[model samples]
Target: MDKCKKVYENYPVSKCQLANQCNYDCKLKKHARSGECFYDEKRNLQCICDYCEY
Candidate 1:
């Protein structure tokens, strides 16, 4: 959490919280399965090339 906070301080709290809740792999999987981007108040997860941004 500390490292993430430091690295992504510019982001919102939800972004940090989501990092703890879901690993990048899990988030990626969910996004793939749902065919949608994973997003929240703090973060946006998706392939930028795919036009998905949270």
Candidate 2:
């Protein structure tokens, strides 16, 4: 949660393929499953990128 952007919900993917078209992740992330847009708190306008964890 510290280093990711939640852009989609239950969006299971091996790597960030949409990163190239969006401003979410410049570098490659692993096990990215779900995410969404963050509009509250100090980190406003941040892409909430969650991972597939147990």
Candidate 3:
């Protein structure tokens, strides 16, 4: 089975950025409801969030 790190490593940067932006609203909603926001390595496929340390 494919793993998240492997899937994340291979996804295109542009696609990942789009995914991140697209996921932002959902992330916010989930956080508001659950009191926690997750960092999806797959959505942040290039580790951009980690690079920026956000």
Candidate 4:
């Protein structure tokens, strides 16, 4: 399908950063619509991936 719904997932990343590098990683990893690093359940910063897939 060319147009799929957007989906979000919590992905654990080894390192954390406030820079754009994380975005670059997830974008390529999951082919995300968007991604960012944030706290997940008191764990170390994790990558939130917003991917396109229904």
Per-residue error at 31 for model 3, in Å? 19
Scored against the true structure, residue 31 in model 3 reaches a CA lDDT of: 27
The worst-scoring run of ten residues by lDDT in candidate 4 lies at 1-10
User: In candidate 2, what are the lDDT values of residues 19-45, reduced to their tens digit?
Assistant: 532223421443455444445476444
How do the residues 1-54 of candidate 1 rate in per-residue lDDT, one tens digit apiece?
121111221333344344343334223644422122244446654321111322
Residues 1-54, candidate 3: write the lDDT tens digits: 222212123324454345454234323532221111234645442422221112
Residue pairs in collision within model 1: none
All candidates' TM-scores? 0.18, 0.33, 0.22, 0.54
Error of 3 at 38 (Å): 13
Off by over 4 Å in 4: 1-14, 52-54
Q: Which stretches of candidate 2 lie over 4 Å from their true place?
A: 1-31
lDDT of each: 0.31, 0.42, 0.31, 0.55
The predicted structure with the larger lDDT, 2 or 4, is: 4
Best by lDDT: 4
